[PDB]
């Protein structure tokens, strides 16, 4: 983009209903830092998401030490705040023709005075508002950097944001390795006798596992059963008689060995 928003007044671009491509943002070497908190930084492709908030502003370069969640600082307690249980990625890279320019860059402002601390994800709108002079034979962390915030929320909703992978035809009555919007797991799948409400996605048990999903492109509902297992037990006489054995499978019948 041509012009961004300030750390005083920032910009919130709500992003939904599109196919993401994080890898092209990952492999391109145009970034000073790439720190994904709560999610592994290369596993960005496989998990499918509900809502995306693109949050862009600019900052003093040493204050990328203070952009971390939980970390205190004059941007953290006054200007821009993350929760402690934040997940997502913050990406910052240098700006020496990008946001650095002459005229100062006094379009972008920072508030240094406030009489309290902040609520996370808040935009607040002596005189408390100032704008830096970007001069690096002082700090090269007194340079402005393009910082961006990719906040995520984990799956509890209709997921609509994920990457470039290709789906496949399903199957039934065979233990497979499934994947639904990022939910992995094993087991067997069958048709649902259970009627389903037209706003949910997930059947969860008492035992905190998933028994019922719906295909995110087909309104059929499937039941999840973990494919059968059992204890392995051996019947034998003593070794001082023979070496013939007897094999016993616990709690499952012989049609599946």
């Amino acid at each position: 983009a041509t012009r961004f928003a300030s750390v005083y007044a920032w910009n919130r671009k709500r992003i939904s209903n599109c196919v993401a491509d994080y890898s092209v943002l990952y492999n391109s070497a145009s970034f000073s830092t790439f720190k994904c908190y709560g999610v592994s930084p290369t596993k960005l492709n496989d998990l499918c998401f509900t809502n995306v908030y693109a949050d862009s502003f600019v900052i003093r370069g040493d204050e990328v030490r203070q952009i971390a969640p939980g970390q205190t600082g004059k941007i953290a307690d006054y200007n821009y705040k993350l929760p402690d249980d934040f997940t997502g990625c913050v990406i910052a890279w240098n700006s020496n023709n990008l946001d650095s320019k002459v005229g100062g860059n006094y379009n972008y402002l920072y508030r240094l005075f406030r009489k309290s601390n902040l609520k996370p994800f808040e935009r607040d709108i002596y005189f408390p508002l100032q704008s830096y002079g970007f001069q690096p034979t002082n700090g090269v962390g007194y340079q402005p950097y393009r910082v961006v915030v990719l906040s995520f929320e984990l799956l509890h909703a209709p997921a609509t944001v994920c990457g470039p992978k290709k789906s496949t035809n399903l199957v039934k009555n065979k233990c497979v390795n499934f994947n639904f919007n990022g939910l992995t797991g094993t087991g067997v799948l069958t048709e649902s006798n259970k009627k389903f409400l037209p706003f949910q996605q997930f059947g969860r048990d008492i035992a905190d596992t998933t028994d019922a999903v719906r295909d995110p492109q087909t309104l059929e509902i499937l039941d999840i059963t973990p494919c059968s297992f059992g204890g392995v037990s051996v019947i034998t006489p003593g070794t001082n008689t023979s070496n013939q054995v007897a094999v016993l499978y616990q709690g499952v019948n012989c049609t599946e060995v």
């Epitope: 023709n97 650095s100 002459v102 005229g103 100062g104 002079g133 034979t137 090269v140």
Partner: antibody
């Protein structure tokens, strides 16, 4: 001291080639663009080229394309300007032109200048 | 267009004010706000004096000033001193760096 020292100048013949360079000191050379701006003796100013730190984005002038090639080395804080097919109108004092740190001046403007070297293309 | 139009020379009395035009095109001057002014002593490199026509960099005295409307920039130097006697160059960057024709300021002594 922010300082730019040109190298590679001399007196060459038309039809031959030459390679210039410029060493940087006093500033982080990897974070700001350097340019070549040429000036014939007693005449006006004329920009030549620009190189990026990743080595992908380069822009040349209209009397420059197809002959002159700029490159840089961010580790050694120097650069190069590979020049082939030299003509006598290219005879100019060549300046490696970048920006220092103390200024708010960006890299597309021209604050930090070099001392220059003379390239003569004559037979 | 190819070379920005400047007066070849501007003569002015010392201590007075002179105005030096930088006439370009709409694709060169009126497109963006990125117009510069460059003082070049003979036998030395150029030196920046004006960015973004309104303001000045660090170390530049307030005698240097600019005005732009449409497609013509106008460097204004009030209080001419003998150390301002050099070559003057204006440059614009919309997609490329286009310099000016050259202007020799002559401080009358």
């Amino acid at each position: 001291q922010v300082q730019l020292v040109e190298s590679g100048g001399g007196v060459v013949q038309p039809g031959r080639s030459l390679r210039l360079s410029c060493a940087a000191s006093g500033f982080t050379f990897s974070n700001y663009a350097i340019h070549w701006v040429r000036q014939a003796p007693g005449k006006g100013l004329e920009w030549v080229a620009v190189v990026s730190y990743d080595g992908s984005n380069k822009y040349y002038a209209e009397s420059v394309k197809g002959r002159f090639t700029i490159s840089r080395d961010n580790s050694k804080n120097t650069l190069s300007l590979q020049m082939i097919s030299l003509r006598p109108e290219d005879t100019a004092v060549y300046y490696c032109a970048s920006v220092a740190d103390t200024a708010m001046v960006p890299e597309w403007y021209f604050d930090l200048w070099g001392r220059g070297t003379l390239v003569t293309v004559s037979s | 267009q190819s070379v920005l139009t400047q007066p070849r020379s501007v003569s002015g009395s010392p201590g007075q004010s002179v105005t030096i035009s930088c006439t370009g095109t709409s694709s060169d001057v009126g497109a963006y706000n990125y117009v510069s002014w460059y003082q070049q002593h003979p036998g030395k490199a150029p030196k920046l004096m004006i960015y973004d026509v309104s303001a000045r960099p660090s170390g530049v005295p307030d005698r240097f000033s600019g005005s732009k409307s449409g497609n013509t920039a106008s460097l204004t130097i009030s209080g001419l001193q003998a150390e301002d006697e050099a070559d003057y160059y204006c440059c614009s960057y919309a997609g490329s760096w286009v310099f000016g024709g050259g202007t020799k300021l002559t401080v009358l002594s």
